[PDB]
Structure formats: structure tokens, C-alpha cells
Amino acid sequence: SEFNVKIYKLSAYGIKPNSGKNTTPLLTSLLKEIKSKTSDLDKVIIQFEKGRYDFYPEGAIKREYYISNHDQDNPKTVGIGIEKFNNITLIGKGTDLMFHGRMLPLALIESSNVKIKDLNIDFEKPQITQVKIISNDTTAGNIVFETAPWVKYKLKDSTFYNTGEGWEMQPTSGIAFENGTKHIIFNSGDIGVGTKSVSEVSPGKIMAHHWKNKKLVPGTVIAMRSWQRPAPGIFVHKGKNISFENVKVHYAEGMGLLAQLTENIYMDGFGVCLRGKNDPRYFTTQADATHFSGCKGEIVSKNGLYEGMMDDAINIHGTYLKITKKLDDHTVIANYMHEQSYGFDWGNIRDTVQFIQSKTMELWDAKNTIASIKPILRNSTDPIKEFRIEFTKALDPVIDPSKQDIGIENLSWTPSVVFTGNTIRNNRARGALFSTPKPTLVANNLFDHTSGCAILLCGDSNGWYETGSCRDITIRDNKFVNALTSMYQFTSAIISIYPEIPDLTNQKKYFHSGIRILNNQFDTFDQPILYAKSVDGLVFTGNKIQTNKEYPAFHSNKKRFLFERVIGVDFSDNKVDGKPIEML
């Protein structure tokens, strides 16, 4: 008021570091009061000190949230709820926010001009279980594994459970890592784990009686997990002008940062990573580091570190609805198709939409405009699965769900992207997924031993229902070091342009266009550099390919360049081991 900013040092308001008390009910009561006073014009700062603050489920808010690309288990146990609260900055000074149990650490809901700064999010007991191979008898298939120090397990009926505060989970798969390098072991990917038929040798030494894998040599560290992903580390819904400066998420039961329906996002020094060379842990998030579902405006993600995640560093995409019924020339019923992306809005009046022929992944050039959109809900308390959309223009009768499978992309909720000077390494699946028609720069990044392919441009309106016909994308001045040591969906080359197209031989229209790959360095042991399916306009120029033998060549695709349904190729000034490689 008489202050430009009101700054609350948290310690002046009964919230101290290293107290080991439950900070949840306190920060919750305090933010509720600061909000009930501060006007929308009013600028607020919440300030944490050097040290550790522990949050537990007790006294947390219970919100029903629908979160793109996550399990829809409700309610969510929310540690810090920033809801309908503007011009607010949470800052720390090497601050460690430590969570317990199954929680959503930080939720930013329907808030504008929120900045989060110099703060670190972690759980004490990750649902991921770290173990070390002690002995592997390849003949008998007996493996003895050592639980890491922080791990509290429980055997019942010869079954290995990992535990924390109010939770107990049996791991079903894992990722294996090289000792030391923390790389993912060559040709491993997702592997089965011996959590069935087990018995305790000695405390934290577990004998797996039926586990056969010649690759899990003594010393191998294994991140045992399930497929569960009920809550991200930071969830952002319907934000405008959101900032993250020097914020690290070290683990969460879900994605590091999941932002949806949010209009501008600025990230300098974001990390989903380990605490350095001394971190005993090999693993970070249970899913994607950073994920942006149906965002718009400008996304800047720069100078970040992403390591050891159970998925990609960044995935930027929309959701295709599937048309289930045409009511008239102007009105359709359209549906959310996937179990992990439903329950949140899809569009607003005046949004630009285009339609897609799901089976051949072909766009109709005829765009439209949403005139009306209302979710269809049989009971008050039902999640959004189904909309009734009205368009301003009338639909060509070729757009009838009873003739073929038809999808809708919202071209209005598409962000532009700057993804520069980041480091991605030692992570499961791909490095980076980009699915946006809007201009996209991917520059001066380091892809250091990603398990799968460095970059994936992929759309699909049949299985995952994730939009992404790309139209404008420069991948320049990057460094790709020994990518693709392991196979995962779509991992055909270091850079894979792989849309999911059920019927490619009958496709007439190219799905992706305007892709530029210039002045990159590829350090590789294998052959595949670029795979490209359904592209019109593909520039590959001034790139440098440097061979090494750090691992054996193995990929089924033995071609540096593999094109399927690709026109518009421009290919000059490229080299392999300093020798020119020309098309002509």
C-alpha cells in the first residue's frame, strides 16, 4: 500500500528452516491471510531462508484437479496452493522444500504474474526405489540387490514393496544405470524387475529367485518403479505470465513441471536434476521433467539442467479431440479419448480450429472458429470428457464421424518456443518432444547420453491423441553425444520426425513442414542421424558427424538418413569425420 512490494520474510511469521515441523498447515493459513488482504493491484513476495522446510499431508488443502498427461486420482494432496492470487513471488536462498507422502508440492491455479525463484523441491522418500546389483548368477537367475540407505521396504508374500508416509507400492519395471557415468545401460530401456519371488538375505539385501538378465552386472544401479504418475512437482493451470528462475525439482510422483492452458512461461535455470557429483541418487522425476499441454504465448526454457528423469526433458503439445457425433452443419460432439488427458477445458469462443482425417493424418485446409463450447455433464459432479462445439462456418459434409475417424486440433492454444543452452542427459525415452505449428528455436543445447533419440516431432490422433503438425522449427548449434543407446517408441534416429500414421501408403498430404536442422554436431557410435516421415520442407545443412566406438553399432536402421513420404529436402555442407556427404 505505502509499499511498492509487501515482502513477508517467512521466519517473522512463525515459519523457520530446519525446525523439522510440519510447515504445511502454517504456510497454508498464512497465504490465506495474505491473500484475504492483498488486492489484485497489490504486489506480494513470500521469502524462505537458507535451510530445510518439511511439508506433510496433514493440514494440506485437498483440491480435485484434472492434470494433462497424468493419472486422475482425486482429490490431490496439495502442499502449497497459489490459487487466484496475482503478482506473487515465492523466493528462497538455497531453500530445500522437502515433501512427505503422496503430495502435489506446488499448484499455481488461475493466477497471473507469478514468479518462483531460488527454491528446490524434493521428497524424502521417492516412490522410485534405488537398488544396487550385488551378485548376479546368470545360470540360476539369482540376483541379490542392495536397497539404498534411505529406502524403507516391506516384504509380504515374497513380494517387494517400497514404502513412505501413508503409501506402499510394488515396483513392476525399472531403468538400469552404469555405475559412475550414471548413463543408462546399452540396449536396456524398460526392463522387468525381480520384485516377485523375493526373500531377505540381511537388512537391505534382497534375493530375487527368478530374475535373468546378463546385463545387470554387479555395480549396476536400478531405479525400480511402477507406471503410476498421480501428481507433478509443479502443476500450473490457466496461468498468465509465469516465471521460474533457478528452481530445481529433484523428484516427484509425476512430471517435474506440468503447465496447461497457460499463456506465457519464462524459465531461466529450471532444473530437474541431481544435487551434483555427490548425489547418491541416479534418478529424478517419475515422468517428464517439463511438460506443456495446450499452452500459448511464448515459452522460454533456457540454461536448465535435466538429468536422470524417467521420461523426456520437455514435451510441448496439444490434445486432438475425436468427433463422436455430428448434430448439424455447425455443431459436433467431440470427446477426450486418452485416460491420462481429460477433465480440463479445451477451447474458448473465437479459437481457430482445424480438422484431421485420423486414419491418414491429413488436415482439411478449411479452418473454423469456435462459436460456442460447453462440456456435456449428466451429473453436476462429473469430469469433462465430452464437449458440444459450435463453429461459425458450416462444415463440408466430408466432416462426418460416421464416414471416418475425425479429430480437431485447437490452433489457438499453441505456444511459440525458445529452448536454448540447456543440458539433457542420462534420461529414459527421448530428450525433447516438440509438437507446435508456432515458431520454435532449439539451440545451443547439450544432449549428453540420452537413452533414446535426442529430439522427436510426433503427432498422433489414434492412440495418445497429442497434437503437433510442426510448421516452423530451427534445430541449430546443438551437440548430440552418443544418443540412442536404447530403443523406445519412435527411436529411429538421433533426430526422429515420426508422426503416428496408421495408413501411410494412401496419405497425399505431408503432416509436418518447415523443419530446419543447421550447424549441429553429432557424436555417434552408430549410423542413424535423421529419420523423417511425412514432411514437406526439410533442411539439413552445415552439420558435422563425428564417429566414435564408445559402444557397438546395433540399430536395425543402418542408414544415416531414412526418408518416408518426404519432399522439399535441402542437404548441403554436411560432413562425416571431416569428409563431405552429398546427395548429388
Residue numbers in the entry: 34 to 617
Copied sentences from the primary study:
The B antigen that is present on red blood cells (RBCs) of type B only differs from the H antigen that defines type O by the terminal galactose unit connected by an α‐1,3‐glycosidic bond to the sub‐terminal galactose. Thus, removal of this additional galactose yields the H antigen of blood type O. For this, we characterized several previously unstudied α‐1,3‐galactosidases belonging to the GH110 family. Our findings revealed that the α‐1,3‐galactosidase from Pedobacter panaciterrae (PpaGal) exhibits superior efficiency compared to previously described galactosidases. Analysis of the structures revealed that the core β‐helix of PpaGal is surrounded by two small β‐barrel domains (domains I and II) as it is typical for enzymes of the GH110 family.
Since crystallization approaches with PpaGal constructs containing a N‐terminal His‐tag were not successful (data not shown), a TEV‐protease‐cleavage site was introduced via site‐directed mutagenesis enabling to remove the His‐tag after purification. Indeed, after His‐tag removal, several crystals were obtained and two structures were solved. The structure of PpaGal in complex with galactose was refined to 2.98 Å resolution, while a resolution of 2.75 Å was obtained for the structure of the non‐complexed apo‐form of PpaGal. Additionally, a stacking geometry via CH‐π‐interaction between the galactose and the tryptophan W497 was found, which often occurs in CAZymes. Interestingly the position of this tryptophan residue shifts if no galactose is bound. Therefore, this specific tryptophan residue which is also highly conserved, seems to have a “gating function” for the substrate. Furthermore, two crystal structures of PpaGal in its galactose free and galactose‐bound state were solved.
